[PDB]
Amino acid sequence: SRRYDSRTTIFSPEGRLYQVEYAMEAIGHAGTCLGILANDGVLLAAERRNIHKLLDEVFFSEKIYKLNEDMACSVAGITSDANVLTNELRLIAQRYLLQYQEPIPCEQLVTALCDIKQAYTQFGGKRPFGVSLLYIGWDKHYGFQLYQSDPSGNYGGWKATCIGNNSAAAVSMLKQDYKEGEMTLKSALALAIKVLNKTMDVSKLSAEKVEIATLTRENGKTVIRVLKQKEVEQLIKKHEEEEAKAE
Amino acid sequence: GADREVQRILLELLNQMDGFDQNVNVKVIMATNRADTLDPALLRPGRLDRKIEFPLPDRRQKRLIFSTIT
Amino acid sequence: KGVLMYGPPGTGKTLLARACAAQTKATFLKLAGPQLVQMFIGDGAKLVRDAFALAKEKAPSIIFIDELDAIGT
Amino acid sequence: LDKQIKEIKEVIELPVKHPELFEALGIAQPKGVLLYGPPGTGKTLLARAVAHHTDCTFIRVSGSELVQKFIGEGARMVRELFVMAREHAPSIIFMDEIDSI
């Protein structure tokens, strides 16, 4: 019936997809996400929004997701569309693995998912997925990697990025304080703690309103880890101490 | 005009209320079913300085009113 | 008591009433829905009340409210 | 009120305490300010604080009060307010409920 149709897949009078624009407008309110590619690691730093004394601790994380042995991604937007996209990503990785017996390279994967998303915003009459992704991984083609996606289907390799709340501010400092090719994993983590401390203007890093991820190569194989409470709080104490000495 | 004359009455009330010396025992009490619809000019100090809620009865008041009416 | 005529525009409504006035002899009063709406509050009712009063006083009579839909909403 | 106090300083104490910087820099001197927000947020308290610190008079009027009965009472009140503010060289006016007009 044409009376109730929404036309979620039709051009506006200036060639801009409105449902897509609103989808990207939803992301600018979910938790902030940060990307930093070091010379010896990659790292995702999003904010833990589910901040209540009556929530339980479950799973190894709350926003970081594994996709292969050598790949992980974090989400900003709707939680449910996030779950749907994560599942499809896992399926893509396993299908490539089954066909070639090699781990799926990273741009292999990111473009497969974005192709699903783009197709979804091209025809069908559905609403688009209101999710923007950040990924991390290693493959024998380009080493440590950091990609990003949007409701449109566009992606991009970023040496450092920010998708989500206060994206402008975070990318502004990331431009001011990024050493292209001159970053260790430790320095990148410290830069993340600083930038996030700015952005999460509500209080300071409580070591509990934050999520951090690291992807490294150890003993010839990838190792993915989510920073515990003690190390995160120690890093924050180091950050405050450094800022105090600086003043 | 009509609204102008009503505004004239209202302003005259305010001007008369403000015309006291705190040494004359003339008091004023007015009742309204909608306080929010009043203009604020009445609520300002010097004029009407107490608002007394008359809420619906609660259990204890319901008991007392029943006993007193029965 | 009363008669109402309804039909699509131009289906012969006012013409029948005009004919009835032509043949009948009691006092006729014309009208229009929009004629009883006055700006001043309480004027339309006074118009109606005085019209019925004149009709009553001047022997038996008929009132023809054309465009009754103006006020009967 | 550190944020608002610093802001009002920078926006008014400069034209009064240091009315030279604007002359040299050629940037015209701001002629007033507007205060807005929910009720009871220290607007009058800050207005009084700045009026006392700047050693200027604090002629005060309420826009609601400005809406009096006599015709032109608003116009006459405005004329009187400005002429008196002119008689007192150091002066700062505090039309309170400008929205009501």
Next chain:
Amino acid sequence: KTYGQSTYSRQIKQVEDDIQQLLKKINELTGIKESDTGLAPPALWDLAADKQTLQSEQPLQVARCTKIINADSEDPKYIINVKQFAKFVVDLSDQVAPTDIEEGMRVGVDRNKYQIHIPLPPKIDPTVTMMQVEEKPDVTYSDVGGCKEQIEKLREVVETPLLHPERFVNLGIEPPKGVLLFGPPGTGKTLCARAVANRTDACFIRVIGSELVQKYVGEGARMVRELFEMARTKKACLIFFDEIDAIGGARFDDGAGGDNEVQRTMLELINQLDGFDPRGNIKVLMATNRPDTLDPALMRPGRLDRKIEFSLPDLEGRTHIFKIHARSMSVERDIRFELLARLCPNSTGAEIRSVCTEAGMFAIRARRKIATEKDFLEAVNKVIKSYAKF
């Protein structure tokens, strides 16, 4: 100085200047000081300082306006209602005959015994008397070109029946009494209406649809009713509603009320046009860019009997319009106006007049005093091509 406008410029300037000086000198030498009490030129305090004012104040008493409400018994006895003074039961002074006075007419009465002396014209809302044309426009039927059948129909419905009633009365045809003129913007509706107003020989009234919406409830209907009563006092009148789509909107009342008072005024106009009360000698015209929005009751024969379509002019009419507007110009002798008609594809009268004026412009900017072909080609370029995207 300047480049030099004309050989006599300085001489005419001098004669003007000394004209102004001699006028000022006579002004000072005659007085005529402006008076804040609205008092006439002293040479025009004439019969005013005396000899008519002193002769008009004695015999011409002050009558007072009163509105008769009833005329009871055959014997003269009149109930009048003096505005904001009182209500009386008075008689006729000798000057007025009993036939002159009717119920509901304003009358003048004296200040002592309040007897009736003179009738007076009715009271008409100031906003309903200005819509009379007073001074008629000068546009005529030679100024409208490329519309020949349309103008024929309009002339046969609004114009011919009044001038020569016997043609129609003999054969027994009551001519149509309404016309709906509709066509693309700027095709010739209001101009043909101006021409009809100029040529016609009866009262003309201009009503804008946007002039009948009013703030207070039940006012627009009163305005329409008064307008038709007034037009019915005259011997014959034409009313030309513009932008009638303004108040002829379709009826769609549903849920929360929206645009209902406009609907009541529209119904009042409907009932005035064709209804129980006969419509006398009145002919109506309407113009709209959007005729579909008009309601099913108005667009029906009996109210809007004809429907004239105005279409963009054909090539012959195109050249004709070009030539009408290029008349009072200082233009070259030979211009292949057929070439200009061809060079502009489907375009309305407003396009063409704009073309003429833009050609005049390109003549001026080149500091020339006679318009040539190149001027018109530049004009057509700058008008059609450049302003296409709008």
Next chain:
Amino acid sequence: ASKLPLVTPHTQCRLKLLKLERIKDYLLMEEEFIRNQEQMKPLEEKQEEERSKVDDLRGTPMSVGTLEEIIDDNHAIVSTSVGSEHYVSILSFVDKDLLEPGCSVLLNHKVHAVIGVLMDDTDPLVTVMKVEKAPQETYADIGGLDNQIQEIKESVELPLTHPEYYEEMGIKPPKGVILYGPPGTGKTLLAKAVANQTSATFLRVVGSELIQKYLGDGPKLVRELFRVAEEHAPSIVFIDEIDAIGTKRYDSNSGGEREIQRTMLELLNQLDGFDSRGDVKVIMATNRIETLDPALIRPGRIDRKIEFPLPDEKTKKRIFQIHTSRMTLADDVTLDDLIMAKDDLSGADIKAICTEAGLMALRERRMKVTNEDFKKSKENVLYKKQEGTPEGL
């Protein structure tokens, strides 16, 4: 002063000269005869005492009534203040040029015969809309347009300056000019300039200020606006942000949009309708013009339509030096370095950059403004762009 019209060709000619010389010579004979009579007899006493007779006829307690209908024949219906309606005789000394319905007439006390009129207030709306001189600046502060300013000058100023040009050839000026273009590009400013530079009464209105919250008030407002423009000699009207009132006119709409359309019809009639518009011009502005109604911007209503592009490379330099004009700057100001970037900057953006740089210079107490401040301010102002980056590109 009610002098004769030459009605020779009206353009510098020999006939205009002889009809002109003749009026001058008659005025000369009249002046000589008058001076002779005045020397021969003052007549001051005779001219006086006519004032005395008049003031005798008009008694001391003259009453201010309100004329309500002139019967066209030296009679009137004058309403006293209470509300009564009298039918009086108009005497011979009242300047009848000043008698129109609604005028405060001055009646006799015992006989109410009309014996004078009074002036009225000049502010129905004249004060509220007229803009007087533009506080911003004259044509000096505007640069980079050149062609556009020339168009406007020819459209609105030149027909006032030298009517002979248009008159010589028999063509009337264009009717109205619509200024259209991207936001912040010099429309309102150019209108302000051609206002403060010309010699007519220029009136300004915002479209959203014609959206009225009582029915039939918007049409009244437009009708008045075009009513006190012929009362005032040559006049100009500039309806800014017209887009808010004139829109595509989609029919599938509900609410107060119908009133918007009805006021639009009133305007559409005022601009070019049944009657002759007299001597008035109409300027309009619209940031978004693709959405106007075809009948509003059609040829006979608005002949001239002006596009307004952004500054390209050099008008940027001009504007920058226009706004930085009044401020002490350090000798390291790499202005071109700020201009060279193809950031699609707009004129209002240039003003924002100038003001923000000046303000932070004030913040840091520094007696002068530095290049680093200007670049930081540029970054800060451009920070108000937003949007979705990969999307659409």
